Design a protein around this ligand. Structure first.
Ligand code: MER
Ligand code: MER
Ligand code: CL
Ligand code: CL
Ligand code: CL
Ligand code: ZN
Ligand code: ZN
Ligand code: ZN
Ligand code: ZN
Lengths: 237, 237
């Protein structure tokens, strides 16, 4: 692990504070602007969609990425949530009601065992079984996110290969002739997350970033700052 | 099937001739500029990478999308071919040597049975087992490409679900916040292909296009004309 404090400019240029963590898979080397904050554990918020979806698929709670989760008919504040969804759109729009239903069907006992088998963060599900990743005791650091994501990328998590492939499909965020990004955003009113990886022809760069997010206005800085770092390191054009 | 002859402008604006075929999956309705050419059968050329990769995966010739196919050390004219590849980069760069090795290992008997089970075009593998899709008797029309691709999208081809998922991953071409394109190009010195689909939040639009391609200079018209049609029909922004 190498600390590049010159990456701090990418945060300070946006009047922001946070951490970007990168992992070169071929070289087995990591880079970050702040080693300490790279290892600071936060609530996963909507980034918990990745383990949650994996467990739900492996237990049969979700059949596949096409299966429709009917809206319960409760109107909530996020407009995108009040409609039918599948695994793809649930991940795209961070539809909490869907993932809460996942967690309830999974149950406390299976959820706890699965997160331990996943070596996921602090592995603590204290709180409501359907809201612990939002207001409970589970915490995960950026380096721990990358550890988890590396296992997912290689199909080495303790779930079926099929479940991992489907979740990685649902993680699809951006793709062009130069790279593929599979990733998941998160925002809990205090900090914003972006965790995932960049697939290249001959390598994969894993990333996990978080930053202080006082207001929603700057949510796009999550991706912008990350991509500005990736471009500086010549990972993407 | 509805013929929209006003789509011909998209070809004539580029001094080109060809066909675009679209299929609205939710409505089960098709649209094309030229119904006749939509049903004209051509050599699949590099679009055969999709059935070939499916068969190779299902027979174990390819383990997964990470498995490296070592370059044989024969230098060929296409620079991208003279290197190691996996299933992702073989599809991206249309690396014929890889697919020829696939076909040889598959063999004539299994290839012929598989294409019949796939209902793939004329189902004729006459010629060399490792070049029939380039210089042999196999032919497929744009509408037949869409018929095949619909089965792939739904995991209804006569191969393992896993094989179909992996090939669809390898087909990934473009993705953003509005759509995902999974597709495959083809070019045989006479005609150019682009076949695939556009995934939206709530629908999928399948497409198959081909056009006369006297020279390589216009290869990019394949995607440009297709995307100009998609934009006209408000399928993509
Ligand atoms: C989880 O982190 C929460 C949701 N996750 C995200 C997110 O990181 O994108 C949001 S923000 C919401 C969804 N997308 C909308 C948008 O237009 N932008 C990203 C600017 C707004 C949620 C708060 C979950 C616990 O609600
Ligand atoms: C199959 O159709 C042949 C290859 N397929 C393609 C193609 O449709 O892209 C090409 S063109 C080749 C690969 N990409 C290079 C490029 O820079 N452009 C697309 C402009 C050039 C091949 C001829 C296969 C039978 O060789
Ligand atoms: Cl969530
Ligand atoms: Cl995918
Ligand atoms: Cl080919
Ligand atoms: Zn900036
Ligand atoms: Zn076990
Ligand atoms: Zn045009
Ligand atoms: Zn059978």
């Amino acid at each position: 692990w190498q600390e590049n404090k010159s990456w701090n400019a990418h945060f300070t240029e946006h009047k922001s504070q946070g951490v970007v963590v990168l992992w070169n898979e071929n070289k087995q080397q990591g880079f970050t602007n702040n080693l300490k904050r790279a290892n600071q554990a936060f609530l996963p918020a909507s980034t918990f969609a990745i383990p949650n979806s994996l467990i739900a698929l492996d237990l049969g709670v979700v059949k596949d990425e096409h299966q429709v989760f009917k809206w319960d008919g409760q109107t909530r504040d996020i407009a995108t949530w009040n409609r039918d969804h599948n695994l793809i759109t649930a991940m795209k729009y961070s539809v909490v009601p869907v993932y809460q239903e996942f967690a309830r069907q999974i149950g406390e006992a299976r959820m706890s065992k699965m997160l331990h088998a996943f070596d996921y963060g602090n592995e603590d599900i204290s709180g409501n079984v359907d809201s612990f990743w939002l207001d409970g005791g589970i915490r995960i650091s950026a380096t721990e996110q990358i550890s988890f994501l590396r296992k997912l990328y290689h199909n080495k998590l303790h779930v079926s290969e099929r479940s991992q492939r489907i979740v990685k499909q649902a993680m699809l965020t951006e793709a062009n002739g130069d790279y593929i990004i599979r990733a998941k955003t998160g925002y809990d009113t205090k900090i914003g997350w972006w965790v995932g990886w960049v697939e290249l022809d001959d390598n994969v760069w894993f990333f996990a970033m978080n930053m202080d997010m006082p207001t929603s206005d700057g949510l796009g800085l999550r991706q912008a700052i990350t991509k500005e770092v990736l471009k500086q390191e010549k990972i993407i054009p």
